[PDB]
Amino acid sequence: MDIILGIRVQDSVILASSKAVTRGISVLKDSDDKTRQLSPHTLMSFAGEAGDTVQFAEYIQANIQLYSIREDYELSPQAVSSFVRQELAKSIRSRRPYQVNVLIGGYDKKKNKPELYQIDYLGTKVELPYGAHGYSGFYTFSLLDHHYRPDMTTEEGLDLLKLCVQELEKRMPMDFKGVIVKIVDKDGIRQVDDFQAQ
Amino acid sequence: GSRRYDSRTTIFSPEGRLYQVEYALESISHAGTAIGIMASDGIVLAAERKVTSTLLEQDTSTEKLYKLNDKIAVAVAGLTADAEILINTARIHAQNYLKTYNEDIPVEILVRRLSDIKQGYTQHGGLRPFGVSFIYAGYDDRYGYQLYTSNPSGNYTGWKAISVGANTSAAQTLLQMDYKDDMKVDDAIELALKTLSKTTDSSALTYDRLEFATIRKGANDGEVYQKIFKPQEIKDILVKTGITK
Amino acid sequence: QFNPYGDNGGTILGIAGEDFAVLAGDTRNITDYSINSRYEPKVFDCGDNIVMSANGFAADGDALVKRFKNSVKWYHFDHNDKKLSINSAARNIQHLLYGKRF
Amino acid sequence: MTDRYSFSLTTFSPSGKLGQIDYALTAVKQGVTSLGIKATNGVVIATEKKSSSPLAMSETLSKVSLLTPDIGAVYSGMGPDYRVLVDKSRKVAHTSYKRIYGEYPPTKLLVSEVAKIMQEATQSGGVRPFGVSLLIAGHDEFNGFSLYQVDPSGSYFPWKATAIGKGSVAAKTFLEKRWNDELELEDAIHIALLTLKESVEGEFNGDTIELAIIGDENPDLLGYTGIPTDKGPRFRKLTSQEINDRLEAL
Amino acid sequence: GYDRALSIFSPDGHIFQVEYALEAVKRGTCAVGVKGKNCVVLGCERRSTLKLQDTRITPSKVSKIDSHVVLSFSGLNADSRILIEKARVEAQSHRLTLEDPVTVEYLTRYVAGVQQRYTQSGGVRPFGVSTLIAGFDPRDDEPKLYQTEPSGIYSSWSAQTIGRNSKTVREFLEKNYDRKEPPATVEECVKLTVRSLLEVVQTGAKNIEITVVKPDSDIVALSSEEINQYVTQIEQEKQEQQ
Amino acid sequence: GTGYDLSNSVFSPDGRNFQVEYAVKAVENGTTSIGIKCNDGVVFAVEKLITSKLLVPQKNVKIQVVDRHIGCVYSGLIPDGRHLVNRGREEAASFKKLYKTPIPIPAFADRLGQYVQAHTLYNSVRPFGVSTIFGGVDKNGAHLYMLEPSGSYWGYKGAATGKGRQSAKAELEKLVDHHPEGLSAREAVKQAAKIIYLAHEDNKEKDFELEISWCSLSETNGLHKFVKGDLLQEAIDFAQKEING
Amino acid sequence: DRGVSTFSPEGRLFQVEYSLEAIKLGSTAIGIATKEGVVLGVEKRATSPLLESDSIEKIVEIDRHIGCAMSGLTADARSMIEHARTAAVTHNLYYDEDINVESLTQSVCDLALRFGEGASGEERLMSRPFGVALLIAGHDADDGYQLFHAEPSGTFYRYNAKAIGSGSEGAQAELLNEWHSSLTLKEAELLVLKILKQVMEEKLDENNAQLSCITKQDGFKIYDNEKTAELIKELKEKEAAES
Amino acid sequence: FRNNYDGDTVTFSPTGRLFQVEYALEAIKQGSVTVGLRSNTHAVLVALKRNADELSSYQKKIIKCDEHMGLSLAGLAPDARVLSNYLRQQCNYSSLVFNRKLAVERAGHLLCDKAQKNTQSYGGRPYGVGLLIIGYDKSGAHLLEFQPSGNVTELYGTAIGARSQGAKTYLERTLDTFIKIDGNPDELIKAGVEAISQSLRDESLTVDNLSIAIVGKDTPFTIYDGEAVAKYI
Amino acid sequence: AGYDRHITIFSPEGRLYQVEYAFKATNQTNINSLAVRGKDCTVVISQKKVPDKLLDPTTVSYIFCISRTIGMVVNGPIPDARNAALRAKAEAAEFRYKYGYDMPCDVLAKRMANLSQIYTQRAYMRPLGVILTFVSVDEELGPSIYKTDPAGYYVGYKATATGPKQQEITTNLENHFKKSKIDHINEESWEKVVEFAITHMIDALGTEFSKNDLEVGVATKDKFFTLSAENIEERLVAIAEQD
């Protein structure tokens, strides 16, 4: 039950996920990134049970890179969102149902618009400027679209996410132990590891 | 016996090539002539028919020329029954793409996938592949119009103007020197009708022996339109193009 | 239903001497209160000075130890009666028990 | 253990075609003569039944069967080759759109799936092809009636009035002489009698000539007096006396 | 289905499937390549004379495995692409397990391993396409060149090519080109490559295609204008009589 | 060439392929073994040709008795004979498994006929080269059925193999006129040694050894016995009593 | 032609008898098992002056205390790598020790020979039984150094000194008097290169051949090109001192 | 054309047999010459096994099953490392399940139909390896002569191989003397040594190439080699 | 290549060579029979020849009982005769408990013909050229005879026979069926119908037989039996008292 967040501004999208390795009595490492690095214009974040989430490694991206190797082209995140969820939905009626909460981000170069998606373990695909899973949506959704504006830039979106972190550092008993900032724009993925020291 | 009468035509023959390659081109020569043309406003696809009689009824009119996707057509040269197996089969593989990325499929995916179906018969299983040559015509948001042509040997070669069937080298010669980078719908049809007249032994050209289905860009809107022309409309094409017979 | 328990009891003591080895066990066989057999030695000989006796269900080890007696011979078939390693002699048993791990 | 022979049929011949196909049409030329016509008022399916023994009963042999109530069929060639297709195509058509939505598919795309299996018999290893060619008529939804010729390859032939069997060349020209936009249901029967019967010799009886019509629905063929959401089994076959009654008018 | 063996064992030791598999390469177009210091250059040609297509719409010999690895084969487009897609899955199979990019030598065996089962296990015939596997190792700028035979035999080389009359064309690089002193500038490998490409396809710039594999995930395809620059320099000092 | 020397899946003009005719010569090239059908039971006969002093008598028994109530014996090729033995014995326990009853002779004969005919229907499956002789006692009476190598079997009052059957028919037909139902079958045991002794005239090479395994309707009533001791040498001396030289 | 079921007039398979052609067409290799170590070597020759011998492996290693080589097609060579090396680890997976060279060969020969027309359980799909002559050598914890060989017939025989290849007819003939019980490691290093020089149609070079050895302590160790060239110089100095 | 009745497995020769057995019977002489016999409780197997070179050593055809039985085969052994090991597993399968000594009559009954199955079912070659199997039970020693034709029999002794017919017939007169002599297994082995001298018309007796096996009541099954046969040479 | 002596392919004459030998070999057994139908019953008579005293006459039969109401007439090779009999008996009990009604003539004749037509598709498995005739008495419709051809073609037969004399008896039966205009025998008392069929059989042969030299059976309503030695001899004697 980690705390995952994210926001899609006008020209780009920003994702922030908690960094912790914790099962139940203890915190192992202060930095844990649940995600994979896709093509520079596409990004995806992971949340859920730590057991099956880390098991991902290369599964979907192996087929995504297979197209990126063959045609040297990057598909839009909207088409990928209809794939990852398509495979996870078939697992419900299989022998071992999987529970994972995924956030599919990235940037579409065809229409020159950013895309961010929120998919739970029930296979629910949605296009939202924001996203959350579990208890991470209770202290956010009230403060997300309330102060959100379509013309908001990147600088105003960095402190907007930190504004919700202040509620997570008090109202939320669990500690996120740092996060990671990755913005996806027309240029590509820009990894910013400075949050508490920002 | 079983081992004595089995010559294994699938494995390597001492021609440097396979038994089933050269002889498959002969059946293509007996097949109707299908000349694909990719124009600026669309893709022109015209094919012939086998033994057009007086009481032969033309309603569906699609025999050697079909349409898979609404934006992507297909043309086959060879035995019709052998082609019909891989017509709906390519659609099943196409509908699986719709289930996958929920969008339009580029032609290049189904080109190599269907090429291994016939090639897999020679590779293993001891079966006989199909001697039917495939011609693919589709649209893309990157390269625009796409026109491809396959062969029973398992390869594929892209062509803007392609000709199969009888007089393959003769039909491609007339369209090679008459080719132009800018061709509209009416420009590419007049060049195809004059070529098909010399391919067969019939007198000039008739609408009953002409199987023609093409694609344009939009009808009421500006994108995504294709329609198979009825044989009644084919007769009106001869009047519009100014060529009666 | 199926009850993999039901052990008849018994106490065996493995003893590793200096130049020797002592494996001793009782011959008593009991079920609950009443006694089954007073003399029932469970100590067998697998060959090449390998003495393996179990404590537990009867047809588990008996179908194993006796099969392990032949399993030691499977090593000697291709090896032309080569002496089996005494340290790892029981290391193969863990792999044979993995088929029954379910 | 069974079916150890994986090798295909005869390979490419120097003529360019398959040798198994050319010999398949020989049984058609040596078989019974069949024909068909679409008058838009009905579909006349007629053929002949060759009896090699005087003790043979024509009531058991039926060359024109009913695959579906709206679709008739007739074959020219070996007799038993069609009976196996009856126990197959009907089971394949059962797995077809009949089970999928409400009804069997129309004759156009139903035969395409039926004839696809016939081509698989000419392809897969260890199976051998047939010697018969079937004429399958029917009634579609938007397109009305239908008539199609099926070679042993299985390519569909959307004809109007055609004839196959022994002496097909002579009997096909007669169908091209008299034609117009729409004929009568009764006139299409008399044309088949002046063609099929006069082209052959030795059988004058109506028991050896099997004729059936499509598009006529009798109220006794439904079986229920309930709401008639559909017309019914348009396929209808003349009896022994009804065939001879048409011969008296010619 | 088929329980027998499609391979024919010849009494003279040379398998008939192996003999006629090289003839498919002899019929196919030539693929020229040469190693280098920081990169590797792979050229090719085309059998078709009149070209109505584009290099972007129709791929022929262009295939990629890893980011720094680009494979170029010679032969049919059916059996060759089968080994390419399986190699890409195998390239992921090392990334799905070792989490590291596979080297060229271990990747070459997988291409030959599928052909190894063809020459051994029956029920399936071998292929006629020979491949030239050239790629870069992680944190290594030294390329590799392996000639993959249909019998599953690979060997290290420096300047090697397969195709129509490629053995005679390779003899030109056995003297002027030296493996002990490789060239430095990337364009120097092209000067020796263009001269070797004119001995088969001869006239025309359409069939001539040059694919230069460069490190840091870079693949540069030379155009027809840059190739003709070295063609003029061939007739400069050659036609002059000293 | 003729097609009957390789593939048995084709049809013969006379009804029997040449390949099946080759199995007939293997039956006559074996060891002579006969059978007895009378009112008191069914008696078999078997001989072992001694080619060297190294052979040990009273060891090899070609008679294979299914349980105690059904005997069987073959001739010629050993593996083709014993291959059918495992087919009947495995199904004998399968019969008593389902029905919990002993199997009668006619129920045992159909399992052999269907088993041999299945080998002749496939070219990839090899039939046998031997003839099967089986009998015993059931809840009805004495029955003797011999399975020919072609698969045909029907009612037999006697069986013959090895030396020509026409030579064995001489002494078998004479017992019908003397005893209509066969009467006492104990004397037939001595007659069996005499019939086998009749074939010893032309076939005499080295020393001979005779074994007898029988079953009775009266004495055994379904049980099984064996000839040994005084009964062993009594039947042997009877065959040599007629002709001493 | 026809199936494999047709035998020879001596009762042998055709693919087994005609497999001796591919043995001679391969490299010329002569193994020798001495009192000290076991000498291994092959012949690379050259297919072209531009051929590089660095990345080609004609001598593999199944385990540290043993060794292997190949002369023939490489298809049946690497097939045993997935088997013999697996069986060697399988022995350590169970009995956790060095497998006997006498037992390992018969254990491999069980997996080395599987073929036929077809079978459901076992895979008979392999046509030619062997097209390559594989060398089997190592050290036994009980007996000692053992030199074995994988024959194209699938059988195995104990060989004091084994010689394969095309020139094996003339090499093995004189090999009877060359091999002795007093032959040491250093004396056998220059003896193999002298015999291979007569079979080699070209000049002896570090890239034309590859040699190695099996040590009971350090294990299987290949000879580097710098070390291989030293044995070539020692041979030229020894041949000049023989007269 | 010979391969009509030979190369085909399902075909029938004009004599009724299969020509694949003819080439299989000849394979006995192509292999090593083996000799074996049995007398009452004790049975002796003396097998001479040649090699391809002076520096070459043979491979062991004899496979040890249990203490009360043994086996010695002639000719080649393509499948013997599998078939005989499968039969050796049946020897332990009979002891660990049926507990019986597995008399040679039952062991040869399954192998008789096992080689025939390859001829009955297309897709496989026959075996063609002669097997001489001996075993001991409460009824004494029992020898099993297994031909590639599926021969099932029992003999006091037999000799098969190349030019071994002379030593086979010469011992027929003394056969009754060898069976009546018990308690001296050394004289029984020396009786087989005389068969080796009579069966070799080319070379003399070897040392390491000679293999001798023996089975008995108290004496288990073992293979004599090296210094063990020094007294029998 | 092109010959049907092994592989089955279409012949240029329009008929398979296997179908030729199937039609060419019919009466090779050299035996005759006849099948006729009565009003409410069915009478079948088959010739029998036993030139041996060691043959049990109660064993050899060409008429087997499939169902309670179903008879059968088979002519051809003995081993292949029981191949279709054992399959028909297994299929008769299946149809009974499948669709809930006993095996009629229109089914068993179709299933065995379709099974024989599948053998035309399979070139590896041998078809059956044995003459097959399925006779029974239907409680609803009536008597029917379906003679299964080796090619799988069946049709309604009012009467049928075997051997080369089939056409000779047909001539005498066709004249009686032309004036009466009935396909079956409308006369009751099947005891006299058996003697009526023997009269047409004597005209073809010309000789008499004994009680065990003639296989005769009668298919009645809801019953099928086989005449014993006493019932057959009674009819051969009683027919002489009339004419």
Side-chain angles (χ1 to χ4, degrees), chain H residues 45-139:
Chain H
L45 296 175
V46 176
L48 177 62
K49 296 173 181 176
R50 293 173 296 180
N51 59 345
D53 187 4
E54 294 177 351
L55 296 175
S56 177
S57 296
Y58 64 91
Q59 63 180 19
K60 294 177 179 177
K61 304 298 183 180
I62 295 170
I63 294 171
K64 182 178 179 180
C65 295
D66 191 359
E67 294 178 351
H68 63 285
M69 67 175 285
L71 60 83
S72 178
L73 60 84
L76 296 175
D79 290 344
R81 292 192 297 273
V82 176
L83 186 147
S84 178
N85 290 337
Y86 176 78
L87 177 63
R88 181 182 64 197
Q89 185 174 355
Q90 294 300 321
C91 296
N92 291 336
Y93 175 78
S94 296
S95 296
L96 274 65
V97 176
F98 296 159
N99 194 29
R100 292 178 62 84
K101 298 293 180 64
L102 181 63
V104 297
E105 183 67 15
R106 180 181 293 177
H109 182 62
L110 296 175
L111 296 175
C112 182
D113 291 344
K114 185 172 179 290
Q116 185 63 59
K117 183 178 179 180
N118 290 337
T119 59
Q120 295 296 101
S121 296
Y122 177 78
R125 66 183 183 276
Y127 297 138
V129 176
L131 273 66
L132 297 175
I133 296 170
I134 61 172
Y136 176 77
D137 60 354
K138 294 181 181 297
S139 63

Side-chain angles (χ1 to χ4, degrees), chain I:
Chain I
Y3 296 140
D4 289 344
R5 294 182 181 175
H6 295 84
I7 190 65
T8 300
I9 60 172
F10 293 161
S11 296
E13 294 178 351
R15 182 181 64 196
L16 298 175
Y17 296 142
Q18 294 83 359
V19 177
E20 294 178 351
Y21 296 140
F23 178 80
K24 184 173 179 290
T26 58
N27 61 345
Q28 295 300 321
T29 303
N30 191 30
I31 195 66
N32 290 283
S33 64
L34 61 83
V36 296
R37 294 182 297 103
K39 183 178 179 180
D40 290 344
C41 56
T42 299
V43 175
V44 294
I45 294 170
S46 178
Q47 188 174 356
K48 185 176 180 180
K49 183 178 179 180
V50 178
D52 186 4
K53 294 177 179 177
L54 297 175
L55 298 176
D56 187 4
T58 59
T59 58
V60 177
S61 178
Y62 296 139
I63 295 170
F64 295 159
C65 183
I66 305 301
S67 178
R68 293 180 179 85
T69 60
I70 294 172
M72 179 178 71
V73 175
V74 175
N75 188 340
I78 295 170
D80 290 344
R82 294 182 181 276
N83 190 30
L86 296 175
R87 179 60 179 165
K89 294 176 179 177
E91 294 177 350
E94 183 178 2
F95 177 82
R96 179 182 294 176
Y97 296 93
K98 183 178 179 180
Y99 296 139
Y101 177 74
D102 291 344
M103 180 66 75
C105 296
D106 290 344
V107 176
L108 178 63
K110 183 178 179 180
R111 296 178 65 185
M112 295 301 294
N114 290 337
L115 178 63
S116 178
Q117 186 64 58
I118 294 170
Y119 298 142
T120 300
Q121 294 177 336
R122 295 181 181 175
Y124 62 91
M125 183 171 176
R126 180 177 65 85
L128 295 175
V130 177
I131 294 170
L132 297 175
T133 299
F134 296 159
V135 297
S136 64
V137 175
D138 187 5
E139 183 178 2
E140 183 67 14
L141 296 175
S144 63
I145 294 172
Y146 295 142
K147 182 178 179 180
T148 299
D149 290 344
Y153 176 78
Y154 63 90
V155 67
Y157 295 97
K158 61 180 67 180
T160 188
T162 58
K165 294 176 179 177
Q166 183 175 355
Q167 294 178 336
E168 294 178 351
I169 297 170
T170 299
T171 300
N172 290 337
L173 296 175
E174 183 178 2
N175 290 337
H176 297 165
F177 295 160
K178 183 178 179 180
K179 294 176 179 177
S180 63
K181 294 177 179 177
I182 58 174
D183 58 353
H184 60 284
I185 303 301
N186 61 345
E187 183 67 14
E188 294 178 351
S189 178
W190 60 92
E191 294 178 351
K192 294 177 179 177
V193 176
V194 176
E195 294 177 351
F196 177 80
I198 295 170
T199 300
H200 300 290
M201 180 172 175
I202 295 171
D203 291 344
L205 296 175
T207 187
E208 294 178 351
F209 296 97
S210 64
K211 62 182 178 181
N212 291 283
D213 289 344
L214 295 175
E215 181 179 1
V216 177
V218 176
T220 59
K221 183 178 179 180
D222 291 344
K223 183 178 179 180
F224 178 80
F225 58 89
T226 299
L227 295 175
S228 63
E230 294 178 351
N231 290 336
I232 294 170
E233 184 178 2
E234 183 178 2
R235 293 177 178 82
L236 273 65
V237 176
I239 186 169
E241 294 177 351
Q242 295 300 321
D243 290 344

Side-chain angles (χ1 to χ4, degrees), chain F residues 124-161:
Chain F
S124 63
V125 178
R126 180 179 180 273
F128 296 159
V130 300
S131 178
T132 299
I133 296 170
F134 59 90
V137 171
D138 60 10
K139 294 176 179 177
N140 290 336
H143 300 290
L144 177 63
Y145 297 140
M146 174 178 70
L147 177 63
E148 294 178 351
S150 64
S152 63
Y153 64 92
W154 60 91
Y156 295 135
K157 293 183 175 74
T161 186

Side-chain angles (χ1 to χ4, degrees), chain F residues 3 17 70 93 185 187 189-190 194 220 225:
Chain F
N17 290 336
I70 292 171
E187 183 67 14
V189 176
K190 294 176 179 177
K194 183 178 179 180
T220 60
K225 293 177 179 177

Side-chain angles (χ1 to χ4, degrees), chain H residues 69 76 147 194 213 217:
Chain H
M69 67 175 285
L76 296 175
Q147 294 178 336
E194 294 177 351
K217 184 186 292 179

Side-chain angles (χ1 to χ4, degrees), chain B residues 2 5-9 19-21 23-24 26-27 30 49 51 53-63 66 79-82 84-85 88-89 121 125-131, chain D residues 5-18 21 38 108 112-113 115-116 119-120 122-125 143 147-148 153-162 172 175-176 179:
Chain B
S2 296
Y5 295 140
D6 185 3
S7 63
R8 291 192 297 273
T9 59
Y19 289 137
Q20 294 174 335
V21 174
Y23 296 140
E26 182 67 15
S27 178
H30 299 291
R49 292 178 63 85
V51 183
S53 296
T54 300
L55 295 176
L56 178 63
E57 184 178 3
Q58 294 178 336
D59 289 344
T60 302
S61 65
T62 61
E63 183 178 2
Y66 295 95
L79 178 62
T80 300
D82 289 344
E84 293 177 351
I85 295 170
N88 291 336
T89 300
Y121 296 140
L127 297 175
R128 181 177 64 84
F130 296 159
Chain D
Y5 176 77
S6 64
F7 181 77
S8 178
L9 296 174
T10 300
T11 59
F12 296 158
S13 64
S15 64
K17 294 176 179 177
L18 296 175
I21 296 170
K38 179 180 76 179
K108 178 59 165 60
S112 178
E113 294 178 351
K116 183 178 179 180
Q119 183 62 59
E120 293 177 351
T122 60
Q123 185 61 60
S124 296
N143 291 336
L147 178 62
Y148 295 93
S153 64
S155 63
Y156 62 90
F157 292 157
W159 290 95
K160 292 176 179 177
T162 188
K172 184 173 179 290
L175 296 175
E176 295 178 351
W179 183 88

